[PDB]
From a paper:
Colony collapse disorder (CCD) is a multi‐faceted syndrome decimating bee populations worldwide, and a group of viruses of the widely distributed Dicistroviridae family have been identified as a causing agent of CCD. IRES sequences from this group dispense with all canonical initiation factors and are able to assemble by themselves an elongation competent ribosome, successfully redirecting the cellular machinery for viral protein production by an RNA‐only mechanism. Using cryo‐EM, we comprehensively characterized how the intergenic IRES of IAPV, a virus of the Dicistrovirideae family and a causing agent of the colony collapse disorder (CCD), binds and manipulates ribosomes to redirect them toward the production of viral proteins.
The binary IAPV‐IRES/80S complex populates three major conformations, with limited differences between them. Class 1 is unrotated, while classes 2 and 3 exhibit a small rotational movement of the 40S. An apical view along the axis of the PKI of a superposition of class 1 versus class 2 shows the IRES displacements are minimal and are followed by the H69 which constantly interacts with the IRES. No populations with wide rotations of the small subunit were identified in our large 80S/IAPV‐IRES dataset. This suggests that, in contrast with Cripavirus IRESs (Fernandez et al, 2014; Koh et al, 2014), the IAPV‐IRES is able to restrict the dynamics of the small subunit, channeling it toward a canonical, non‐rotated configuration. The limited dynamics of 40S subunit rotation observed in our large cryo‐EM dataset reflects a solid anchoring of both ribosomal subunits, mediated mainly by the additional contacts contributed by the SL‐III characteristic of Aparavirus IRESs.
Numbering used by the authors:
A (entry chain Y): 2 to 72
B (entry chain W): 1 to 83
C (entry chain An): 1 to 25
D (entry chain S): 2 to 133
E (entry chain b): 2 to 99
F (entry chain B): 2 to 218
G (entry chain X): 2 to 130
H (entry chain D): 58 to 278
RNA sequence: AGAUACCGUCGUAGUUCCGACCAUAAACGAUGCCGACCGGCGAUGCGGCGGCGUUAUUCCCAUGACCCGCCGGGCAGCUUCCGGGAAACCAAAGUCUUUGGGUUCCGGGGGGAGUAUGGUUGCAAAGCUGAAACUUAAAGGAAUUGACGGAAGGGCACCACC
């Protein structure tokens, strides 16, 4: 705390209330931008109909096909 | 050193600086016992008894050992009061 | 890319992005 | 290109501090001593050592040697162990005393003495090295 | 990392010193920043002065000297080998060697 | 040393500290030398108060006497000015000298042949003989120094304020040191002057060894 | 400027301990400093002092021994109950044998232990061990 | 094995003329011998190796990979140390670092939190110790707790016999080089910390270089 | 090879002044500001003091120009186991797990991005405010060893030269 004063609870709380949004985990859980853009939409699971198959190539040094499914 | 009973409960009572009073650690190797030999008023020679003043390592590298040894013998009855 | 000439290329394109919003006024 | 090695120089220095007696100035005198005071499986290594010994045996006769400490260098201190000269700088009756040092003795027991001579202070005080 | 304590220059309470131009190049290097040399030198060095005393009409006329205060930029000072890279402790020596 | 009239600065002693050049100090002042100085002269020279020269050396002799073993008290001089001056102390007192080239690492490194594990050091110049001071601050080794107006009071426990720069000023401040230890141990009496001359301790210039054959020819 | 006298005067004593100075002149002389220094005197961490009277704010020279480890102030002046005092003496003192938090009770300036005996808390001043 | 000692400190130890190494930690005299510890505190001594850390200086062609043994040490009644020795193989450094661990075994001050009755169990103060950016801070605990800490600073506090402790490591504790030394420094600053217990003014009793000087004059030169 | 490049020759706006706009710089000491405290020394800049003499208008003083120090504040310096720090380094970046002298701004892995959008000022260029989706196991700081350099300096060789 840069300010320590005895009547500074309306700057310690208000500054914390502002700088907590710069926390990338907090802002994600408290905006309506991340919550909607989640393909599931605040779900632990989701049923879906398979409408094609994609042999996704492995990213880096491991050369292998990660046989995935479009859902 | 006491427990509630009262007997010495630790395994040694360490040294304590004669100049500053801050204690001397078990591996403060720059520490110094410094004995001064006791001189008779008339003869001007060593008796057998000894006058001891210890300083911690932190004061010798501070440059205030021979300011403090000077005062630990000015008004302890070794060196002149006028000086 | 130099951080100065990246900043200049973002500017030239901001002048372009504005021109493709100006034609609807 | 004949610089002595460490099995020649040190090997010579070990002999001279131990054997100042047996050696001398001439090479052929202390070439043959190295048959007795060294067990060397090399004719060449012997002459290299015994040759460098004589070069150092000419340096105990002109001064001291670096890596030596012998009874002769205990005897070197022994000669001037009680070198007493003629009456020195602490048998003087007219001694140069700085005038502002007359104040630091007047405050003590020693106000005015027998065997001093006072001077006068030097005006135009210019002692410092010019800055630069 | 901060290589030098002074920022390769010799202003500490100014913020702005007007640049005097380079001589080898024409780089706008600041005044304090520039490696400055002041040349004090004979107009004929050592071989020609042997002769010109015989062509001098006057009774042993000593020559005029030639006065050039050089302004080097840092890329020019080290190109012509005026100044020179030094070891991390040798850097801080501000003593000019004769 | 303190208000005893027997260890009072005697009439024979001041005129040695005047004639040697011990009141003659340096031009630069170390901030912890105002406590050993009377007043700054003209020509920028510091008068070392010769009572405050005297008073320190008596306890410095108490210090050497306070060591029961005379052997383990090491005495140090790397500058030529005091190399002989500390060497003549060695035989008389029963001490160990360092008359030029202290090997850095003797007190700490065991397996060096010259392994002095001393109990007390005596130092000519703290700046010049600075190497043992560090090793004296690495084992429990108290430090005595024949200090000056220029020399710092660093890593030294009792300072003896001298002019340790001058040729015949050094050996005189070693002779008074060598006397006072033998006086207290029980060699000399304070009624008669000690037979050994202070000029014995003075380092002879090899330029002036080339002279005396002609000087009294 | 100096906005706490009990802080910047006892910030001056702690630099004289850590260096090892025998006595220290601490320039402001408030009513709070004397009744701080006395509770370090009465408990016997520091030696005796004297307050130099000019026609200003006074000055204080304190005889320090090396018995004082750290003099530590708390700013601002937080109210302390008797059950909340248990938490202050936890995080701000080394052991629960030695070390005192002095605090300004209604009954007067005294250590946490005497405020615990007399059963009256107040605003906090600082600690010393 | 004999150990015919070299140092004046170690010369008195072999003859059973110094009573214990409790004087050695009083006079702060350096134990530069490795058989003074195996003599006294070697009795109930348990030496366990924390880390085996290879380090690679890059050469002209290839790497010179050495090894490092961070060896914890201590009898379970009032002494521990930390020894770090770097050597080219795994058998040398482990054997070598125990010696450097023994040369730097320190006395730990154990005592009492709260009521000062019974056996000494805990650290008697909030000591700190920090090398690198690591900051291991050891607090007195209530009884029968156990050392609530990381695997390693517990492993040294167990060796000390400091049963009750509260640890709060802060900084990059990933590097075990700085994490074993910082916790070691905290239990090296227990007898560097002036408690009101220690105010009974220390009289300077005769040093074993003064006390035994006549033994130290006719055993050698 | 090609240089709407480095090099050269011209040369437009520009550079210059006045009147307005613009409000950004590695605007850096990459270090907010007021206050306290904690080492040393040589310097210097300004003011004031105290202290022999030298020269200056000699016609003695007031007084400069020097000179020894002192004090106040500023610009930096130098050294140090004060202490810190990841280190390089720093009497401040110190007095910080033994954590609170006050107060402002501000940071929260790297990118996306100072981008999108609204708001707002500007004649325009643009400024201040300023996300998110998606993406990724690092980006980075300091230091050490090597390799390397179209870096500097010192060597060795008729597998170099003379």
């Amino acid at each position: 705390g840069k300010c320590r004063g005895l009547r500074t609870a309306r700057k310690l709380r208000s500054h914390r209330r502002d700088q907590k949004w710069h926390d990338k985990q907090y802002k994600k859980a408290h905006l309506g931008t991340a919550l909607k853009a989640n393909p599931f939409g605040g779900a632990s699971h989701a049923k879906g109909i398979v409408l094609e198959k994609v042999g996704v190539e492995a990213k880096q040094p491991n050369s292998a096909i990660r046989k995935c499914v479009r859902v | 050193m006491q427990s509630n009973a009262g007997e010495f409960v630790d395994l040694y009572v360490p040294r304590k600086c004669s100049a500053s009073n801050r204690i001397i650690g078990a591996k403060d190797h720059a520490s110094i016992p410094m004995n001064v030999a006791e001189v008779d008023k008339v003869t001007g020679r060593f008796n057998g008894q000894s006058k001891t003043y210890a300083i911690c390592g932190a004061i010798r590298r501070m440059g205030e050992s021979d300011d403090s040894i000077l005062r630990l013998a000015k008004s302890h009855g070794i060196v002149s009061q006028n000086f | 890319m130099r951080a100065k000439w990246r900043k200049k290329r973002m500017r030239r394109l901001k002048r372009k992005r504005r021109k493709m919003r100006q034609r609807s006024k | 290109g004949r610089v002595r090695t460490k099995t020649v120089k040190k090997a010579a220095r070990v002999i001279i501090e131990k054997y100042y007696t047996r050696l001398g100035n001439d090479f052929h005198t202390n070439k043959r001593v190295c048959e007795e005071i060294a067990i060397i499986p090399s004719k060449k290594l012997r002459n290299k050592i015994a040759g460098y010994v004589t070069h150092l045996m000419k340096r105990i006769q002109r001064g001291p040697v670096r890596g030596i400490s012998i009874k002769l260098q205990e005897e070197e201190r022994e000669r001037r162990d009680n070198y007493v000269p003629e009456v020195s700088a602490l048998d003087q009756e007219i001694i140069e005393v700085d005038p502002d040092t007359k104040e630091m003795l007047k405050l003590l027991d020693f106000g005015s003495l027998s065997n001093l001579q006072v001077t006068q202070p030097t005006v135009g005080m210019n002692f410092k090295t010019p800055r630069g | 990392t901060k290589k030098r304590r002074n920022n390769g220059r010799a202003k500490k309470g100014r913020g702005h010193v007007q640049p005097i131009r380079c001589t080898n190049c024409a780089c706008c290097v600041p005044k304090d920043k520039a490696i400055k040399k002041f040349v004090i030198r004979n107009i004929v060095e050592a071989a020609a002065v042997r002769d010109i005393s015989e062509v001098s009409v006057f009774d042993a006329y000593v020559l005029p000297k030639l006065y050039v205060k050089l302004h080097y930029c840092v890329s020019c000072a080290i190109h012509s080998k005026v100044v020179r890279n030094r070891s991390r402790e040798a850097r801080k020596d501000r003593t000019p060697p004769p | 040393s303190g208000a005893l009239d027997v260890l009072q600065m005697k009439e024979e002693d001041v005129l040695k500290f005047l004639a040697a050049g011990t009141h003659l100090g340096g031009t630069n002042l170390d901030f912890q030398m105002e406590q050993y100085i009377y007043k700054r002269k003209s020509d920028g020279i510091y008068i070392i108060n010769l009572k405050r020269t005297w008073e320190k050396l008596l306890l410095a002799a108490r210090a050497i006497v306070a060591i029961e073993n005379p052997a383990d008290v090491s005495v140090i001089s790397s500058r030529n000015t005091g190399q002989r001056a500390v060497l003549k102390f060695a035989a008389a007192t029963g001490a160990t000298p360092i008359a030029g080239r202290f090997t850095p690492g003797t007190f700490t490194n065991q397996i060096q042949a010259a392994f002095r594990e001393p109990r007390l050091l005596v130092v000519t110049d703290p700046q010049a003989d600075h190497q043992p001071l560090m090793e004296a601050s690495y084992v429990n080794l108290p430090t005595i120094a024949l200090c000056n107006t220029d020399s710092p009071l660093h890593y030294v426990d009792i300072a003896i304020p001298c002019n340790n720069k001058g040729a015949h000023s050094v050996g005189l401040m070693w002779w008074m040191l060598a006397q006072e230890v033998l006086r207290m141990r029980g060699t000399i009496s304070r009624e008669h002057p000690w037979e050994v001359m202070p000029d014995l301790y003075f380092y002879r210039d090899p330029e002036e060894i080339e002279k005396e054959e002609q000087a009294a020819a | 400027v100096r906005m706490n006298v009990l802080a910047d005067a006892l910030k001056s004593i702690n630099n004289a301990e850590k260096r090892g100075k025998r006595q220290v002149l601490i320039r402001p002389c408030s009513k709070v400093i004397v009744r701080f220094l006395t509770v370090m005197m009465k408990h016997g961490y520091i030696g005796e002092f004297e307050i130099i009277d000019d026609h200003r704010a006074g000055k204080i020279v304190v005889n320090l021994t090396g018995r004082l480890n750290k003099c530590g102030v708390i700013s601002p002046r937080f109210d302390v109950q008797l059950k909340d005092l248990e938490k202050w003496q936890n995080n701000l003192l080394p052991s629960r044998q030695f070390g005192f938090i002095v605090l300004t009770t209604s009954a007067g300036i005294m250590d946490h232990e005497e405020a615990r005996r007399k059963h009256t808390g107040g605003k906090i001043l600082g600690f010393f061990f | 094995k004999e150990w015919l000692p070299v140092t004046k400190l170690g010369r008195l130890v072999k003859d059973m003329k110094i009573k214990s190494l409790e004087e050695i930690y009083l006079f702060s005299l350096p134990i530069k011998e490795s058989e003074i510890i195996d003599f006294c505190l070697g009795a109930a001594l348990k030496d366990e190796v924390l880390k085996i850390m290879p380090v690679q200086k890059q050469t002209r062609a290839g790497q010179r990979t050495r090894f490092k043994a961070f060896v914890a040490i201590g009898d379970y009644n009032g002494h521990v140390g930390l020894g770090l020795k770097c050597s080219k193989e795994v058998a040398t450094a482990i054997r070598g670092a125990i010696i450097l661990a023994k040369l730097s075994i320190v006395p730990v001050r154990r005592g009492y939190w709260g009521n000062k009755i019974g056996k000494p169990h805990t650290v008697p103060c909030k000591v700190t110790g920090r090398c690198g950016s690591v900051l291991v801070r050891l607090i007195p605990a209530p009884r029968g707790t156990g050392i609530v800490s990381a695997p390693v600073p517990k492993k040294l506090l167990l060796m000390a016999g400091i049963d009750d402790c509260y640890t709060s490591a802060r900084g990059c504790t990933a590097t075990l080089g700085n994490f074993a030394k910082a916790t070691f420094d905290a239990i090296s600053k227990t007898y560097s910390y002036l408690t009101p217990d220690l105010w009974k003014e220390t009289v300077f009793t005769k040093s074993p270089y003064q006390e035994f000087t006549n033994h130290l004059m006719k055993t050698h030169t």
